[PDB]
Amino acid sequence: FLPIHGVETPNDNELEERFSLCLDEWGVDIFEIDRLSNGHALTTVAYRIFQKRDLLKTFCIDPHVFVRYLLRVESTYHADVPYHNSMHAADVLQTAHFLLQAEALDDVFSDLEILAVLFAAAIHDVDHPGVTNQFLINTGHELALQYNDASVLENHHLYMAFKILTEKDCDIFANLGGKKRQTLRRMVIELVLATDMSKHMSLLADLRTMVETKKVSGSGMLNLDNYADRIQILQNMIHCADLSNPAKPLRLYRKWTGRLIEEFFRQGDKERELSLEISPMCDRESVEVEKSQVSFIDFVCHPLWETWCDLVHPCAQLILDTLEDNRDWYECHI
Ligand SMILES: [Mg+2]
Ligand SMILES: [Zn+2]
């Protein structure tokens, strides 16, 4: 008695068509999936990916339960936050689903590790209030005091996703063994913590380490039986996915960017209003959109994707190309 896409929609055959051809593609139109499904990108994309990877069958997750949990997660994203809402989460979830398909990663990950990274992706920004970690620290907000300045929002997103599992008939993980639930919980934690930006430099250093260890190996592929290595990859992977907008098709990159800048400007408006110094990129009086994108691509996004593409060489070529064309496009619109 379950609609073909988990929750009901006005546009079932269109959506079937989009999901059937697009979900293993780089560069999916999450905004249209959202409009076509009446606000339910997250729930629909997640339902379909978990069906497509056989994850309901594999972990005995009741599909009514999955759907209800996601509907609640989706509701606890804030629709009025311009960028960090459930469409962002649907994007990151699909993108991570894509980056798992690279031929150089076939049979490296257990199914529980796949489950972890995709669940993490779906929840990684749940309840975001549209302000950065630095803002919450700089303002002495309750959350920053509580988490002692460390991964403030990421910790909070995790808290909210786990409380929701409690609620009546929402525990998708109910039929997993005890030592699995606890293993999964450990991974999901580590994965959503890896989306905190202040870990960027550290993760990228571990990822290059592992690139260098693959270039010098006798059999040009990596010993990935150590769980500690695997989880590093997966930490980088969900962070790549979170920083994927500048490597998406130009039109989608620009839509994502207009939203991000509106979020940032609103935060600068709150800073101005409290006599605080205005965060980078948050100042509507002073900021220069194009120059900020070129500099973010040069200093953060390109060196991350370059190293990722080097690990999975050559299965992520299109990413790096689209990223570079986007860089150049933004440079000559300065
Ligand atoms: Mg985040
Ligand atoms: Zn995010």
Describe the structure concisely:
It is classed as hydrolase. The chain is mostly helical and about 325 residues long.
Write up what this structure looks like.
The protein has helices at residues 12-22, 30-36, 41-52, 55-59, 63-76, 86-99, 111-123, 133-139, 142-146, 152-166, 178-193, 200-215, 227-242, 250-273, 289-311, 317-332. The protein is mainly α and 334 residues long. It has one domain. It binds magnesium ion and zinc ion (ZN). Residues 88, 92, 124-125, 195, 242 line the site of zinc ion.
Ligands, deduplicated: magnesium ion, zinc ion
Q: Figure out the total of helices.
A: 16
Approximately what portion of the residues adopt beta-strand conformation? under 5%
CA radius of gyration is: 20 Å
Q: How many strand segments?
A: 0
Shape: globular
Order of helices and strands: HHHHHHHHHHHHHHHH
Number of domains: 1
Structure class = mainly alpha
**Span between N and C termini?**
54 Å
State the helicity in percent bands: 55-70%
User: Could you give a short account of the major beta sheet?
Assistant: none
PDB class: hydrolase
Keywords: cAMP complex, hydrolase, phosphodiesterase
Assembly: monomeric
Entry title: Schistosoma mansoni Phosphodiesterase 4A
